[PDB]
Amino acid sequence: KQNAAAGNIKIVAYPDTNSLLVKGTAEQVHFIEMLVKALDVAKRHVELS
């Protein structure tokens, strides 16, 4: 329900396919998804001489 607690979410890493499993309510899943895509970005390359 819309008033479910933040502490109920569970996250399990699954490297076999480089993916994540998330358990919660629909709105929680949605927020988690937004945070994930706010976090991962393609790192720049640097060369040092």
Partner 1 sequence: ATPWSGYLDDVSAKFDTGVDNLQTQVTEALDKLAAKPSDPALLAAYQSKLSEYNLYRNAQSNTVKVFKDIDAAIIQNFR
Partner 2 sequence: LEEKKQATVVSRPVLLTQENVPAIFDNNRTFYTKLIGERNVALEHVTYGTMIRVLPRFSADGQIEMSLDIEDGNDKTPQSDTTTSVDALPEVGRTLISTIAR
Report the interface residues with partner 2, using CB under 8 A: 15-18, 42-43, 45
- Nearest-angstrom CA–CA distance, 28 and 33: 9
Q: Which of 1, 3, 10, 12 binds partner 1 (CB under 8 A)?
A: 10
Q: Which amino acid is at 8?
A: N
Beta-strand ranges (E) seen in 1-49 are 10-14, 19-23
Q: Which is nearer to partner 2, 5 or 42 (CB)?
A: 42
Binding status of residue 7 toward partner 1 by CB under 8 A: yes
Q: Which is nearer to partner 2, 2 or 18 (CB)?
A: 18
Identify the residue whose tokens are 């899943």.
29
